[PDB]
Amino acid sequence: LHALLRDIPAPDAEAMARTQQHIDGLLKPPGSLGRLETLAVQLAGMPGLNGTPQVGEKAVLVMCADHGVWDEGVAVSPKIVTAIQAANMTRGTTGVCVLAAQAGAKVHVIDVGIDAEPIPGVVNMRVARGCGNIAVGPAMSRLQAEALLLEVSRYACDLAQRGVTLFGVGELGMANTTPAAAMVSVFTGSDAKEVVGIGANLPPSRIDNKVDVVRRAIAINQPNPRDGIDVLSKVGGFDLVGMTGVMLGAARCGLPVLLDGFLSYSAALAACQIAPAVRPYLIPSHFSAEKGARIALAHLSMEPYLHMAMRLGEGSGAALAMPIVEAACAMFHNMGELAASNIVLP
């Protein structure tokens, strides 16, 4: 793990320079394709990409797990939904499944701690049957967190070896917006009220209780904002940990990772905190309809591409952005050049 972290590669400045130059000579006014150009340069800097914006196979990794904090009345979805929805992922009827199929990506469902019997078809990396209730203690032990990071990290890089070049990250876990908010509050220093959202349709009247629960989690655990693993293990969850581990794994493999929404933003804060070297490999997707979204993105210094008011999770946002990435590549590779058209601009 220390190793892993130490071995995350820096972006290739030379490939990025060549990229920029090539982009500038394309059949268009310089800088006219904006963020599409920026994205391309960004991809070119990623070592696992072989010095050019490329997209081979794509995968969406969905980390599933239950949370003890559910018992605090913070989520209106029945607890069983995690297990149910996880099974559905195997059938391709879920939102993420549908969107991923549309993007030509494959969905990997990972059980990191669902409180139910094992689901055949799902990758088993179960830590425990649900995590601890952050309201009265830690979500898990530091050890547990590090082990899972490690394990997920490896699974992630191993995929690279099978042709995957683009990852998408997501989750599934009733009550997960609670630990997400607590993390955000901690890393960001925002008061709970400012970051606590409606999650999966929590009635406005139940909001207040959700805020108190977050403050309690923090008060009791005293997570150290300067230590991402500490924060994750205390007020996080197994699914939060898994997502962070996907990020670490893709970075180590020098590959790009598309974020999803709020939950993913929390994970991303943790990752960057643990290893700043991770930052350049992250790509935002959409702008989540969760209340704490703006705060979390500001701290990541990220501006998503899509404004869809989505708040489903599962990695559905990450899948929806996949075509944008491929577009940046197509632009780079298939557009003709000014010079060939004998076009001269000031």
Binding residues: 85, 171-177, 200, 262, 288, 311-312
Nearest-approach distance from CB 185 to ligand DMD, in angstroms: 22
Of residues 93 through 132, those in contact with a second copy by CB under 8 A are 93-95, 98-99, 101-102
314 noted as active-site residue: yes
Which residue stretches of the chain are H helix?
2-6, 13-24, 35-44, 81-91, 95-103, 142-160, 177-188, 192-195, 207-221, 228-235, 238-252, 262-274, 293-299, 316-334
The C-alpha angle 230, 189, 295, rounded to 5 degrees, equals 110
**At residue 253, what is the residue type?**
C
Which residue in 14, 194, 314, 337 is the catalytic one?
314
Q: Which does 172 bind (CB under 5 to 8 A by kind): ligand DMD, a second copy, none?
A: ligand DMD
312 binds a second copy (CB under 8 A): yes
Contact 314, 170 (CB under 8 A): yes
If binding is defined by CB under 8 A, does position 24 make contact with a second copy? no
SS3 state at 45 = coil
Residues 235-274 that bind a second copy (CB under 8 A): none
CA angle (19, 26, 304) in 5-degree steps: 60
Contact 188, 225 (CB under 8 A): no
Among 26-34, 60-68, 112-120, 136-144, the segment contacting a second copy (CB under 8 A): 26-34
CA-to-CA distance for 203 and 201, rounded, in angstroms? 6
Residue located via tokens 């990852």:
167
204 binds a second copy (CB under 8 A): no
Q: Of a second copy, ligand DMD, none, which one sits near residue 307, judging by CB under 5 to 8 A according to partner kind?
A: a second copy
Nearest residue to ligand DMD on Cβ basis:
77
CB of 200 to ligand DMD, least distance (A): 5
Question: Number of helices (H) and strands (E), helices first, in the chain?
Answer: 14, 6
Residue 91 in contact with a second copy, rule: CB under 8 A: yes
Residues of this chain that interact with a second copy (CB under 8 A) are 26-36, 76-78, 81, 84-85, 88, 91-95, 98-99, 101-102, 200-201, 289, 303-312, 316, 320, 323-324, 326-327, 330-331, 334-336, 341-346
The catalytic site residues sit at 314
